[PDB]
Amino acid sequence: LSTSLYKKAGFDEYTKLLHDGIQPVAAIDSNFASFTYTPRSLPEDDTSMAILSMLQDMNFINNYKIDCPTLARFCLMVKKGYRDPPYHNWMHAFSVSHFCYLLYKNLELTNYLEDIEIFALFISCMCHDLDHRGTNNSFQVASKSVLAALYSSEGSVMERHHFAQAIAILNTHGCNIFDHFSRKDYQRMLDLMRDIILATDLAHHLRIFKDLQKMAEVGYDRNNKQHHRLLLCLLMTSCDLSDQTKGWKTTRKIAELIYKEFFSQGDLEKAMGNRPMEMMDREKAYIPELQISFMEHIAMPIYKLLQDLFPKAAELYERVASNREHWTKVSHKFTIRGLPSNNSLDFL
Amino acid sequence: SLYKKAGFYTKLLHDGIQPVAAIDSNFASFTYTPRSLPEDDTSMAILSMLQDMNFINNYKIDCPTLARFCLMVKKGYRDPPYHNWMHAFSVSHFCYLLYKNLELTNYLEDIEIFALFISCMCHDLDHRGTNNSFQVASKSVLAALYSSEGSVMERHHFAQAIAILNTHGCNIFDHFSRKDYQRMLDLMRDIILATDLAHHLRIFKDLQKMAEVGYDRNNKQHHRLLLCLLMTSCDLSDQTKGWKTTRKIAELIYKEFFSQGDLEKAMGNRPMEMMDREKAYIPELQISFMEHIAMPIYKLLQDLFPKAAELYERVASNREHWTKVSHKFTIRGLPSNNSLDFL
Ligand SMILES: Cc1nc2c(c(CO)nn2[C@@H](C)c2ccc(C(F)(F)F)cc2)c(=O)[nH]1
Ligand SMILES: Cc1nc2c(c(CO)nn2[C@@H](C)c2ccc(C(F)(F)F)cc2)c(=O)[nH]1
Ligand SMILES: [Mg+2]
Ligand SMILES: [Mg+2]
Ligand SMILES: [Zn+2]
Ligand SMILES: [Zn+2]
Numbered sequence: 001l002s003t004s005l006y007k008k009a010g011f012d013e014y015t016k017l018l019h020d021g022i023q024p025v026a027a028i029d030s031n032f033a034s035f036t037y038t039p040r041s042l043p044e045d046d047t048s049m050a051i052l053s054m055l056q057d058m059n060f061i062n063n064y065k066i067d068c069p070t071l072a073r074f075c076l077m078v079k080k081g082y083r084d085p086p087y088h089n090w091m092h093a094f095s096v097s098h099f100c101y102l103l104y105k106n107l108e109l110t111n112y113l114e115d116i117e118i119f120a121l122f123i124s125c126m127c128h129d130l131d132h133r134g135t136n137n138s139f140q141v142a143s144k145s146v147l148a149a150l151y152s153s154e155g156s157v158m159e160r161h162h163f164a165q166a167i168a169i170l171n172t173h174g175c176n177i178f179d180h181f182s183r184k185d186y187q188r189m190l191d192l193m194r195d196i197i198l199a200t201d202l203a204h205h206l207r208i209f210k211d212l213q214k215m216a217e218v219g220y221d222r223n224n225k226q227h228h229r230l231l232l233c234l235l236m237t238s239c240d241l242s243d244q245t246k247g248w249k250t251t252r253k254i255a256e257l258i259y260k261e262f263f264s265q266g267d268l269e270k271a272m273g274n275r276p277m278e279m280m281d282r283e284k285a286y287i288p289e290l291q292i293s294f295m296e297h298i299a300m301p302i303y304k305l306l307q308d309l310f311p312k313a314a315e316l317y318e319r320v321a322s323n324r325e326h327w328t329k330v331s332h333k334f335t336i337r338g339l340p341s342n343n344s345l346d347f348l
Numbered sequence: 349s350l351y352k353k354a355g356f357y358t359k360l361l362h363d364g365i366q367p368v369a370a371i372d373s374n375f376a377s378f379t380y381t382p383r384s385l386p387e388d389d390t391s392m393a394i395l396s397m398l399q400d401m402n403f404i405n406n407y408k409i410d411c412p413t414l415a416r417f418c419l420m421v422k423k424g425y426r427d428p429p430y431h432n433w434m435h436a437f438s439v440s441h442f443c444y445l446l447y448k449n450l451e452l453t454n455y456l457e458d459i460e461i462f463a464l465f466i467s468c469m470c471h472d473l474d475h476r477g478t479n480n481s482f483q484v485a486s487k488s489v490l491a492a493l494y495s496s497e498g499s500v501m502e503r504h505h506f507a508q509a510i511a512i513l514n515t516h517g518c519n520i521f522d523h524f525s526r527k528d529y530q531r532m533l534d535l536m537r538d539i540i541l542a543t544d545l546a547h548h549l550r551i552f553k554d555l556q557k558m559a560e561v562g563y564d565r566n567n568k569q570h571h572r573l574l575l576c577l578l579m580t581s582c583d584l585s586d587q588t589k590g591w592k593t594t595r596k597i598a599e600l601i602y603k604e605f606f607s608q609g610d611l612e613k614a615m616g617n618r619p620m621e622m623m624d625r626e627k628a629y630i631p632e633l634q635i636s637f638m639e640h641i642a643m644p645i646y647k648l649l650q651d652l653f654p655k656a657a658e659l660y661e662r663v664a665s666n667r668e669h670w671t672k673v674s675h676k677f678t679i680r681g682l683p684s685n686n687s688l689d690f691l
Contacts, residue, residue, distance in 0.1 A: 149569045153551045154541065155498065171527050184514045198497065208496050226492045 003260075004268045006083035006134050012168055017072045023049055025057045033057075033105045035315055038246055039098035040091055047094045048075045051126065054101040060119045065180040074175045078126050081165055085134030086264075087257040097125040099242035103235060107310045112222055112231065116185070120192035121232055123177075125239050127166035127193070128200050132158065134261045135268075137201070142274060156201040163197040192232070199233035200240050202298070208233055209301075216308035231309070237302050238316075244299045244323055245316045251323045255291055256345045263338060282338035288331035295324035349611045351426040351477050360415045364395045371396060376448045378658055381589055382441035383434055383596075390437045391418045394469065397444040403462050409520055417518045421469050424508055428477030428607075430600040440468040442585035446578060450653045455565060459528070460575060463535035466509075466520075468582050471540050473508035475501065478608045480544070485617055499544040506540040535575070542576035543583050545641070551576055552644070559651040574652070581649050581659075587642045587666055588659045594634075594666045599688045602630055606681060625681035630688070631674035638667035 025032045028042070028050055042050060052071060055061050061068065082090040100122045103109055109118050137157040140148040151160040167190065170176050178186050198204055211226075212234050221227050243254040266280035278284045303317040330348060340347055368375045371385070371393055385393060395418065398404050404414065425433040443465045446452055452461050476490075483491040483500040494503040510533065513519050521529050541547055554569075555577055564570050586597040609623035621627045646660040673691050683690065 150572070153547065153554070167530060171530055176526070183519070187510060187514060195497070204496060211496075229493075 001268060001271050003264045004134065006085045008080075008083055008131070010080050012081075012131075012165070014069070014072055014076060017048055017052075017076070018068060022052045022056045022061075022068065025053050028053055033102065035102055035106060035245065035319075037098070037102070038250055039095040040243075040250065042094075044091060047090070048072070048079060051075045051094070051097060054097070055122070058101065058104055058118070058122070060115075060122070063115060064119065064178075066177055067179065070174060070179065071177050074169065074177045075126075077169045077172060077175050078130070078166075081127075081130045081169060083132060083134070085132065086260040087254070088129050088132035088134055088261065093126055093129055096128065096239045096242060097122060099239040099245075100125045100235070102242075103238070107312055109235075112220060113228060116189065117192060117228060117232060120189055121196055121235060121239075123166075124193045124196035124236060127169075128162055128197050128236070128240065129158075130162045130165035130169075132162070135265050138277070139265055139269065142269065143272070156198055156204065159198050159201045159204075162200075163194050166193060166197065195229070196232055196236050199236045205233070205237050205298075205302075212305050216305050220309050234302065234305055234309075238306055241299050241302060244295065244320045245303070246319070248323060248326050251326070252345050252348065255287060256339065256343065259285070259287055259339055260343050285338055287339070288327050288334050291327040292324060292331065295320065295327060300324060349477065349607045351428040353423075353426055353474075355423050357412075357415055357419060360391055360395065360419070361412065364392045364415060365399050365411070366392060366396050368396050368400050376400075376445065378445055378449060378588065380441070380445070381593055382438040383586075383593070385437075387434060390433070391415075391422055394418050394437070394440060397440070398465070401444065401447050401461070401465070403465070406458060407462060408523060410523075413517060413520055413522070417512065417520045418469075420512045420515060420518050421473065421509075424470075424473045424512060426475060426477070428475065429603040430597070431472050431475035431477055431604065436469055436472055439471065439582045439585065440465060442582040442588075443468045443578070446581070450655055452578075455563060455574060455652075456571060459531065460535060460571060463532055464539055464575060464578060464582075466532075467536050467539035467579065470509035470512075470536070471505055471543050471579070471583070472501075473505045473512075475505070477604050478611070480546070481620075482608055482612065485612065486615065499541055499547065502541050502544045502547075505543075506537050509536060509540070538572065539575055539579050542579045547576070548580055548641070548645075555648055559648050563652050577645065577648055577652075580645050584642050584645060587638065588646065588662045590662075591666060591669050594669070595688045595691065598630055598634055599682065599686060602628065602682055603686050627680060629674075629677075629680055630682070631670045631677045634670045635667060635674065638663065638670065643667060 028046070029037065031037045032050075039050075052061075052068070052075065055066070055071065060066065061071065078093070079090045082088070082093060104118060104122075113121075135143075140157045141152055147157050147161050151157045154160060170178065170190075178189050181189060208230060212230055215227055215230050220231065243250055262280045263282040263285070266276035266282060269276040269280065275281075279290050300317070300320050303313065303320045306313040307317040333348065339345070371389070372380060374380045382393075395414065398409070398414065403409065404411065421436070422433050425431070425436060447461060447465075456464075478486075480500045484495050490500050490504050494500045497503060513521065521532050524532065542551075551573065555573055558570055558573050563574065586593055605623045606625040606628070609619035609625060609628075612619040612623065622633055642663050643660070646656070646663045649656040650660040676691055682688070
């Protein structure tokens with residue numbers, strides 16, 4: 001049960017960060033702007049600089065006149081804002097943010113969304129799981145947590161907390177990256193971040209799914225305000241699940257992290273005298289079938305919509321479909337429930 | 349179903365801040381009927397109440413900015429039978445009565461009371477005389493913006509309030525620090541969202557629990573729950589007045605609801621009973637509303653504030669009057685002239 005203890009490094013580095021200026025994206029890696037780049041390969045100590053590099057490459061620092069020391073402090077505060085569970089940690093937020101940058105470079109998002117909307121999407125990616133406890137929304141209610149007391153009445157418990165943590169950072173002395181905005185634009189920016197972070201709740205995704213399908217059917221209209229809103233939600237879910245667009249070795253490792261996290265929650269629920277849901281129970285869970293279901297009912301339809309809207313996103317859908325096929329192959333040589341005793345999927 | 353917006357100060361600066369007894373000797377009493385005040389005197393009365401609660405001085409509110417803000421809020425309401433400016437003014441007046449009679453300063457932070465009052469003024473801004481289900485059924489721009497999030501109209505009312513604050517010369521909170529400005533807007537969001545009946549249904553179990561264990565002023569959840577309870581008591585305060593007030597407000601509420609029902613029939617949709625002039629039995633619906641919604645709110649208010657007992661007793665008395673009337677009433681909907689005087 002001690003595996004459910006995930007620490008915060010501080011409370012709710014910098015001069016060294018900007019010492020040699022912002023590194024151009026190609027100097028980080030020649031493959032940095034490619035769908036074949038695996039952001040989790042980047043040393044954790046280099047991620048803060050990579051956030052600044054992406055924002056500079058997307059021209060947001062220049063367009064929004066972002067004070068670089070304020071941006072450096074904000075980046076570091078966001079990074080410090082994640083705990084250390086197996087999956088919902090800063091490297092997850094970093095990977096999600098990188099994928100938003102990949103969509104910008106490869107899908108030519110500037111021809112579909114307003115500059116401010118893309119910038120809000122990127123910042124939302126960085127913040128979208130802030131202070132995650134390695135437990136889901138249902139656990140918050142069951143454990144009668146401070147978070148459930150605060151947000152169960154307004155829905156999407158963790159997501160509302162992630163947004164509140166983002167605002168708390170913007171309100172910390174020397175971290176307000178949106179200080180060059182007028183009161184009107186600052187308000188628009190926080191309303192965009194609120195909606196985008198809320199879009200990471202799977203229940204929200206399922207609620208707008210028919211609207212996303214209709215938008216992909218009729219075709220995206222850049223002069224349609226609802227199309228902009230729907231597209232921002234779809235893109236946020238695509239960034240959140242972007243590990244599924246990588247190579248087999250990435251998807252397998254991410255399944256190991258996800259199930260180690262889920263199973264620790266299930267074990268904690270058992271120690272509390274409760275019955276966890278099947279996928280969180282190491283004695284009931286069959287990982288290959290659970291991953292196949294997740295790929296077929298959640299991940300693949302998101303990337304199929306992405307391909308329907310953006311033909312250049314075809315390679316992403318193809319990679320997710322190929323990883324679903326890999327789980328089918330694993331299902332014919334994986335004879336255990338849960339994870340092996342060593343918590344590793346290396347035996348494959 | 350067509351309810352217009354009137355648009356897209358010097359008089360209020362000359363004598364807008366009047367002592368409250370000059371408005372009415374009974375102005376600070378639970379027996380006052382704010383709907384009796386001429387509409388043309390309501391902006392002055394809002395200023396008088398903010399001065400009487402000492403919010404203007406305490407928060408260094410700029411008076412011309414406050415006068416502009418009040419006028420903008422008043423102009424931000426349409427003219428449906430019920431959800432108009434007179435409704436927001438009467439709701440604001442009740443918040444003032446709670447401040448004057450229940451010693452709120454002993455349960456909530458000054459800023460929470462101030463946010464509650466401003467939220468009252470703004471809580472139904474730009475209301476269309478239709479509920480949240482109608483927004484979704486009509487595929488309106490409001491449903492497009494907020495239906496996936498929930499509480500369609502309440503999210504719009506809050507958006508309208510912020511749009512007024514962001515209008516030149518109307519930002520009554522401009523001088524506030526970033527943290528305080530954020531705190532105020534977050535309080536307004538939470539309080540306006542608490543006016544959705546769907547939200548009240550979801551928090552009733554917690555409200556009941558708070559009243560049972562007893563209010564704890566050091567408990568942050570208690571402050572949030574108390575604000576929701578106070579806001580709903582302000583929103584339903586017409587039920588705490590005399591029989592003539594509750595009869596007249598039922599006339600306004602149902603003229604509004606029946607118009608939505610007519611619109612739904614024209615869309616080829618089956619409206620719910622309450623909105624259907626051909627199915628609705630007003631006394632039955634009013635008794636159900638009093639028993640399930642209004643009376644439990646005022647009973648929880650009496651449990652937390654014994655000085656609020658007179659409010660619960662008045663609501664219970666009005667419910668009894670609807671039950672007696674539910675024999676002297678035989679018709680569905682409203683008569684041709686839309687009057688309930690036949691009781
Ligand atoms: C069963 C399962 N759940 C997963 C996986 C991953 C990694 O790609 N994330 N999640 C969860 C946390 C998740 C689901 C759904 C959204 C959405 F709402 F954005 F779509 C976000 C997050 C996975 O591999 N298996
Ligand atoms: C059926 C019915 N509904 C009424 C009445 C009144 C007037 O007192 N207002 N409402 C609705 C609009 C309403 C309900 C409930 C909240 C709450 F969530 F804040 F409690 C707000 C508003 C009434 O007399 N009958
Ligand atoms: Mg999340
Ligand atoms: Mg309302
Ligand atoms: Zn995430
Ligand atoms: Zn109201």
